[PDB]
């Protein structure tokens, strides 16, 4: 590699990320997994958000490319480091209980935002050209600002239950 791609974490989302980390690892509080707003729906939101915010948009080539890419990227990378060591039992439970459950499903916004945090070093693996880099970082920041604009409405940390002791045994 030659250029370390700095994806740039939005400073508005940093307090949420720090709280997320704390809530999961330190507080050991976990929400009921079933996510009504899954990654697929979030991608759909973002895709249609472009065309409705603009007037004569034709970047659907890249929008669809991004949606397809993110979907598979999130899917293929799910389980490796898109979740904390404390989220292992969630991953385990999903696969064991529903072997037909899509990895791009079942999980909601927190995991998609999780992706954007880890993609930072991931982009350091990928030697992207300036054109594609600038265009992509644009979409990513558009996505980040879309999330950040709904940090209170979409991201909810109140409905978190302290994971039961036996459940802790399925993580650590």
């Amino acid at each position: 590699s030659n250029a370390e791609v700095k994806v740039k974490i939005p400073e508005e989302l940093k307090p949420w990320l720090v709280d997320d980390w704390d809530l999961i690892t330190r507080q050991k509080q976990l929400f009921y997994l079933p996510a009504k707003k899954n990654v697929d729906s979030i991608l759909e939101d973002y895709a249609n958000y472009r065309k409705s915010r603009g007037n004569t948009d034709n970047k659907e080539y890249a929008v669809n490319e991004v949606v397809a890419g993110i979907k598979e990227y999130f899917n293929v990378m799910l389980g490796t480091q898109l979740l904390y060591k404390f989220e292992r039992p969630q991953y385990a439970e999903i696969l064991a209980d529903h072997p037909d459950a899509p990895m791009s499903q079942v999980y909601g916004a927190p995991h998609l935002l999780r992706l954007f945090v880890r993609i930072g070093a991931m982009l350091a693996y990928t030697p992207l050209d300036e054109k594609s880099l600038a265009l992509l970082l644009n979409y990513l920041h558009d996505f980040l600002k879309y999330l950040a604009k709904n940090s209170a409405t979409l991201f909810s940390a109140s409905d978190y239950e302290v994971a039961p002791p036996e459940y802790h045994r399925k993580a650590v």
């Binding site: 690892t25 598979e72 480091q81 880890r118 990928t126 992207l128």
Partner: protein, 42 residues
Amino acid sequence: DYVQPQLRRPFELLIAAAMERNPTQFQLPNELTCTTALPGSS
């Protein structure tokens, strides 16, 4: 006359790199919290 940047290759490359990611652990950057220890005390 202009050729727009293409995301297809980037995603190809990025996913290929993701294929090489073993299940380690998600960690946040040093500025956010930093959960890594430094090799020292020696």
